[PDB]
Structure 1
Amino acid sequence: EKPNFLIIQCDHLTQRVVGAYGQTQGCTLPIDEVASRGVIFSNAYVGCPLSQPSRAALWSGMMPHQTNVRSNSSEPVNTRLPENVPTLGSLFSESGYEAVHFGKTHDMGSLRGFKHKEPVAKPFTDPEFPVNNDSFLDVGTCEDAVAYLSNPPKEPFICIADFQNPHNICGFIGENAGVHTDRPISGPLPELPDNFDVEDWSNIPTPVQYICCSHRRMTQAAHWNEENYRHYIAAFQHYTKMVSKQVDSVLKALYSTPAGRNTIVVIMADHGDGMASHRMVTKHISFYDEMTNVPFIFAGPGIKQQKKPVDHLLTQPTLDLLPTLCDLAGIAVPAEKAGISLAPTLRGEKQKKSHPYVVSEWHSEYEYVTTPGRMVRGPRYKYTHYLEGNGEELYDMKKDPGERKNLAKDPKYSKILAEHRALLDDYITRSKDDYRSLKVDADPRCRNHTPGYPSHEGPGAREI
């Protein structure tokens, strides 16, 4: 009849690690099996590479400057979503769907309309990698979703399973902070990425120069060697395999009932992880693909299999998931929502409405450093601007997908730069963005040493 929906979201999950995108084998087989039945987008940019802003934005179908959840800080710095704002869950709930949510919330009110159940951490010992409450909560989340999908009560439903992993990578970094010899592992060690090194630190913006100061985990990884970073990637894959096994459990529960086959499965992330690219660990300030270009996978009744990743559209899950699911469910979407339904692409029809560019925002994490930034991703180039120092990046995503050569200061590229600044102005105007009025709050002690993370000195912005 009317379709059910199962949204499986993972914190930190990256395209590179997901086999469906063609770079890594062996980490996400169950996700790749869903993908093979359906469609995956190659350009799927989140409106902010940080948990709370992305999630606030996602489930209300807005951008972060509009929700006013621009960091992981609570009220009053950030504002909870008012109950008069339509939401994925209110839209679906008001139409007669049962709407349930399991796992990580971190939503600041944007989950309104979902009946939420809190997972209970179920601890266990891993013999090779550090595991913590992130991993343990996921055992609970998985048990909750399994029990629900193994017996609904009832249909039509929409269900979200919000997993923590591979977020446990953060705990790994803390256990392996600073100069160190790595704990031996039994796997083959993954190679560093081709974009690992930063070739010229003078040619990236001030806030990116000093992520080692403002970001605790960059502080902790600042002086790591190549073995260290390669163990970081092995651990990322481990936690990715861990959550994939839970995705597998949840899907087995889905298809153990007749409801399963009438269910549209979406698989995504709120943001990704640096994975050593550009020396990065986790996420902070920067807009590189590793962090802002997430897995975005659909399969189910009425969605046509496409073997080739959709790479001719710029997608923005943060905006587009709300309209896409509402479309497929036959629910009217409030005209103020700026997202675009991908349901035509998913049904194997031509996509006549599409995003001419997609955007991402940075503000702060916990308001130690406030250094607002904006990314504009056009059909071919990615442009970056930061207020602090008026820094700019410009990257050729066709010939330099690894983002190793900033072209912003290359005269050959000035009309391309002008054109992309002009898109940012378009975004700022149409979205009512206050970017240009915003103030930096970046202590000079966090901009002290020579640019770049290996040259980092001191404890970082934590003090104070």
Structure 2
Amino acid sequence: RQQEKPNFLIIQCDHLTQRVVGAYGQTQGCTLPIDEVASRGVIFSNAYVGCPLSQPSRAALWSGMMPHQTNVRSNSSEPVNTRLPENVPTLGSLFSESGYEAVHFGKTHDMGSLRGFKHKEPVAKPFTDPEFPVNNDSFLDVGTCEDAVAYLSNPPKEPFICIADFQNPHNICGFIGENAGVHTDRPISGPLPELPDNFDVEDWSNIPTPVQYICCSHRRMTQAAHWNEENYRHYIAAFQHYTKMVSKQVDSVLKALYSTPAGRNTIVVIMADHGDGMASHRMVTKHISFYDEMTNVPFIFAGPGIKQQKKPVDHLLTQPTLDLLPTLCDLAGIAVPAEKAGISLAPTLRGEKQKKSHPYVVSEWHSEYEYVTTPGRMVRGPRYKYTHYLEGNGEELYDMKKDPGERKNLAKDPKYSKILAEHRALLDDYITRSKDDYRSLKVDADPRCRNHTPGYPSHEGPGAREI
């Protein structure tokens, strides 16, 4: 038993959302291979990432730390962001030093947190799509899929830990570029998805300043700011298409996995580095805001020793950015360094009592490319989500039980003043225990990016990257 170790296959998809994954109960037909894995295992309803942005999320994830601690807080490359020091234990270092073969395929964008994995760079394999634009994101996934299939088809050593980091549905970014501004959409042959119930922003004066002006600071939002309903539904359709594309590749990867006896000895994890607005709150992609579509990601486990659960686990707050490292170490029988703040979910996965749990979980924003630096923090408690931004001391407060779509900010309502204070207190506790420098940080927000009536439809001009 204890010397017979499982393998691991970690499949991560950039921008993948709970909404689009059928296992979560909202959208049918886009992720059947992922849903089949979920059906054999356990999915988590509350799985919040440490930052809704790729490089900060990935640097944090593979090191099991938070972004203010890695100090990789934006997507900028060296020297604005500096690679994780070589003395910080990572997933790869812990697994490699315990005798695992550790391999990584696909997207990196890790700022050194992948140290210990042997990385193979994918090669772009272009192809033509008859209905949606496809770019090097989609072409790279073809290479990644080929590499992962080749590896899992003939695994040279057990035990192994393999990461397959897919780009899609990130090609949604390219879609927005091809459809920027006022435009008529190219016809498509599918049924057209409906807008979500939280599409509209009811009151722009009741949201924080940085969220009001995402249209100025986020290039993709500048592009989509004046989109009509048709435009946004075609956006959702494209997102579903790119998700279907990556799910076919997941299928190929799983077929390769289960083509040898290594497969049945493998624990499969499916997650995303962050989500996508999917037109909720008029939002496209990810930038500044902390709404569930972007921060609450699919987080799915199945494999030997993991007990099947039909219902999603919703009595726990999880933080994949912190919890993946100790969970995988616990499943592999590898000791976790004491400084890591994550909590192993292996008890829940085994069907045992989860004695330790997070009383709340957190997300961070700092900047994307240092055009605008507008730090903020999210605290998800058991029932409410609280957000705070330094710029204007803006706050949000959402009842996630009665208002899961986050349509009614409760922060200015005196009836909720005690709940608001209570979540402010969770942020104070986080700052103390994590040594967050949040309270000391400076806002850098040019007033030319805050210079029209609040809200994306009223956006005028070319946005921050242009001025």
Alignment TM-score, normalising by the size of structure 2: 0.99
Alpha-carbon shift at residue 79 of structure 1 (Å): 1.9
Counterpart pick for 1:323 among 310, 323, 326 = 326
**Could you give the per-residue CA deviations for residues 340-361 of structure 1, whole angstroms, max 9, x where no partner exists?**
0000000011100000000000
Aligned residues: 464
Alpha-carbon shift at residue 397 of structure 1 (Å): 0.2
SS of residue in 2 equivalent to 1:290? helix
CA–CA distance in structure 2, aligned partners of residues 53 and 298 of structure 1: 23
CA–CA distance in structure 1, aligned partners of residues 461 and 146 of structure 2: 43
**Could you give the per-residue CA deviations for residues 206-240 of structure 1, whole angstroms, max 9, x where no partner exists?**
00000000000000000000000000000000000
CA–CA distance in structure 2, aligned partners of residues 404 and 360 of structure 1: 19
**Could you give the per-residue CA deviations for residues 164-207 of structure 1, whole angstroms, max 9, x where no partner exists?**
00000000000000000000000000000000000000000000
CA–CA distance in structure 2, aligned partners of residues 140 and 463 of structure 1: 34
SS of residue in 2 equivalent to 1:429? helix
CA–CA distance in structure 1, aligned partners of residues 466 and 122 of structure 2: 34
- The answer on 1:188 being equivalent to 2:191 is yes
Partner residue of 2:179? Answer: 176
Alpha-carbon shift at residue 77 of structure 1 (Å): 1.8
CA–CA distance in structure 2, aligned partners of residues 149 and 285 of structure 1: 38
**Could you give the per-residue CA deviations for residues 61-103 of structure 1, whole angstroms, max 9, x where no partner exists?**
0000000000000122222100000000000000000000000
CA–CA distance in structure 2, aligned partners of residues 24 and 89 of structure 1: 34
CA–CA distance in structure 1, aligned partners of residues 12 and 166 of structure 2: 6
The correspondence of residues 115-264 of structure 1 with structure 2, limited to 5 A, is 115-264=118-267
Alpha-carbon shift at residue 138 of structure 1 (Å): 0.2
CA–CA distance in structure 2, aligned partners of residues 332 and 109 of structure 1: 22
Alpha-carbon shift at residue 154 of structure 1 (Å): 1.4
Counterpart pick for 1:354 among 339, 354, 357 = 357
CA–CA distance in structure 2, aligned partners of residues 251 and 304 of structure 1: 19
- Give the share of equivalent positions with the same residue, in percent: 100
Counterpart pick for 1:40 among 34, 40, 43 = 43
SS of residue in 2 equivalent to 1:185? coil
**Could you give the per-residue CA deviations for residues 113-161 of structure 1, whole angstroms, max 9, x where no partner exists?**
0000000000000000000000000000000000000001010000000
SS of residue in 1 equivalent to 2:466? coil
Counterpart pick for 1:59 among 51, 59, 62 = 62
SS of residue in 1 equivalent to 2:188? coil
Q: Which runs of 5+ in 1 are unaligned?
A: none
CA–CA distance in structure 2, aligned partners of residues 120 and 80 of structure 1: 24
**Could you give the per-residue CA deviations for residues 307-346 of structure 1, whole angstroms, max 9, x where no partner exists?**
0000000000000000000000000000000000000000
CA–CA distance in structure 2, aligned partners of residues 383 and 161 of structure 1: 33
CA–CA distance in structure 1, aligned partners of residues 433 and 76 of structure 2: 27
Alpha-carbon shift at residue 463 of structure 1 (Å): 2.5
Counterpart pick for 1:290 among 290, 293, 298 = 293
Q: Which runs of 5+ in 2 are unaligned?
A: none
CA–CA distance in structure 2, aligned partners of residues 44 and 31 of structure 1: 16
Partner residue of 1:414? Answer: 417
CA–CA distance in structure 1, aligned partners of residues 465 and 79 of structure 2: 20
CA–CA distance in structure 1, aligned partners of residues 182 and 190 of structure 2: 22
**Could you give the per-residue CA deviations for residues 29-72 of structure 1, whole angstroms, max 9, x where no partner exists?**
00000000000000000000000000000000000000000000
Spell out structure 1 runs of 4+ moving beyond 6 A.
Answer: none
- The answer on 1:376 being equivalent to 2:361 is no
CA–CA distance in structure 2, aligned partners of residues 215 and 131 of structure 1: 22
CA–CA distance in structure 2, aligned partners of residues 112 and 123 of structure 1: 30
SS of residue in 2 equivalent to 1:462? helix
Partner residue of 1:102? Answer: 105
CA–CA distance in structure 2, aligned partners of residues 76 and 131 of structure 1: 31
